[model samples]
Target: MIVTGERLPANFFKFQFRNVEYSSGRNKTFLCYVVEAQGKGGQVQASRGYLEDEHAAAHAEEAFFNTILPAFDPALRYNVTWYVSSSPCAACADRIIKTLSKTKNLRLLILVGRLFMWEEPEIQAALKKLKEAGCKLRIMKPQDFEYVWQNFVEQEFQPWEDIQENFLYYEEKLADILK
Candidate 1:
């Protein structure tokens, strides 16, 4: 079954990137996450952040550590994806790498809308390490956004024009990040 949200957008993976405007990343980076834990247990959890909380984790990390991981038996195999609003920072990426190292039978995929400091030498190194460690990463497309909107939103529709515009904008951002 596809786990749905109460107030969240679908689940934590979708929640991480759905806002698209909660700029507390202060880098103009708005992020969210959808964490799906299954096997011994199953749940899809979502979190944005305590935008006002100075020490809060990025939405993706927060959902895993606080909600999804804790729900599992620790012996069950599971898969999770992070639908990121932007590519992760060095700290977040490092943490995810660490989690991947210790979490057996855990598979993760990160679909990104754009890059934040992707050009940084440290992040390039981090990305390479993450790739080596078997984490998956890819760019999000407009149809992906449409899935989030069509499935997660509680009311109203995401304007078709806005989704089209974002396709160009996010694709541009990813282009620069990729280069």
Candidate 2:
């Protein structure tokens, strides 16, 4: 699983831009998670960092599943949110769906910075599956990006030139996928 290490670098936010094409280039996925148990209004647990993936921690989704999810008290109902650089791949989507089925106490909301391989039919289907399985998926808004930057990025936060435009683009794309 993840090593739970340092905060993400400033430049890492560039990969989160929805307008960019990252398919051909190999890149690491960074995920920041927040957990709040039901009825716990103000108190919440949050983790911000790009942990070193030893073996099974290559994907951010897998890293969360392997390292973070298990620590929750099964009896407690919780709300989980993940701010990730990329949407889950088809394989990870399947695993996430299966886990969601088994773990009834969690409500997962994933705000992805970008959609990965949306042009592929399988990837589209996987995203649909995730939506149908009760995952709330959305493109990161300007506020969301700022939140991540303030909380997870070590450097001072600054908005990108086309942040709003990129969000609108991905919002449309995600809506079409869910439709």
Candidate 3:
């Protein structure tokens, strides 16, 4: 079940750890990514990313470079689907944008819980920049929320019990997309 970074079956993900916390401090990470192996009729290895860093953001960046990358062959073409509460930090935006130019090895699909990060001048530019670099980006809808909850949290959810702002995060984010 440990993906360690190998290719998986077509259109299927082998989720390992979702938002697996590394630090004791409460983290405001709004997004996490589920990375799976590329190709069809494959071993279908799947793994996720999160790591402790000096920055107080989620583990998407750490997980991508340290955990997931090593699992794949350097030459194999890959695609990753990442979910976040917000767009990554400035450094993350820059790094991934840079990564895109260097090689086409890893393609990315960015799914987010909220798009507020895009309001920040730099972060917004980064996402807009990532889009230019061919990284696909989208706001996560209710269905996506449910999918993440079920697959990553492994829990039953009552939407009525959830905070209304949680849902607002997506609506306001739509405005960001248009901005």
Candidate 4:
């Protein structure tokens, strides 16, 4: 099931995404994504969803590919944006690079709430590979939280405590990782 309203903020916690620690609790990745397509008559069709890793299906990113991609018109150009609780792992990064190469008409922007094993050399290389493949990666800021809360979530937005601090911390760490 999709998470929203009251349940989303608890999962999208700043510490969960921004922690300097190597591993955090729950070991789940929540991904909230939006796909926007330029339609006929200059219209834009947008669809959004919130998903998490599941034993019943697949990783959140894989779930998107398995389920979501099939519904869209393949020939249309689209912009896809993902706001995820944790950054993609090395395997997922490789998959994402492959997806981008195959879907030449789509552009992707990823905003991560926290790093997933950012200290590891392989994961760092994965992030670099994604950047080289033209993915726009960013550490989620307060505005991004507000954006998700407004659009993808069911409740009104409120800034959590230490949100800015965590964003700043992760921002620096991500810079180092990508560099």
**RMSD for each model, in Å, please?**
7.0, 5.1, 8.4, 4.4
Q: Candidate 3: worst 10 consecutive residues by lDDT?
A: 6-15
| Number of the top-ranking candidate, with TM-score as the measure | 4
Q: Model 4 off-target regions past 4 Å?
A: 1-29, 39-43, 71-74
Clashes of each: 8, 0, 10, 1
Angstrom error at residue 35, model 2: 0.7
Runs of candidate 2 exceeding 4 Å displacement: 1-10, 15-27, 39-57
lDDT of 1 by residue, 61-121 (tens): 5445554455444655656666556766677778878878877667778777665566678
- The TM-score, computed over Cα atoms with residue i paired to residue i, of candidate 2 is 0.78
Q: For each candidate, what is the lDDT?
A: 0.56, 0.73, 0.57, 0.73
lDDT of 4: 0.73
Query: TM-score-based ranking, best first?
Result: 4, 2, 3, 1
Residue pairs with backbone atoms closer than 3 Å in model 1 (clashes): 12-33, 12-34, 12-46, 13-33, 13-34, 16-31, 16-32, 16-33
Which sections of candidate 1 miss by over 4 Å? 1-63, 157-179
lDDT of 2 at 83: 83
- Candidate 4 on 1-179: residue-level lDDT in tens? 34433555645564332322223332344578888998556666888886654223345666677777755556667889998877887878988898888777778899987778888999999999999888989988989888877776555366877778888998998898777
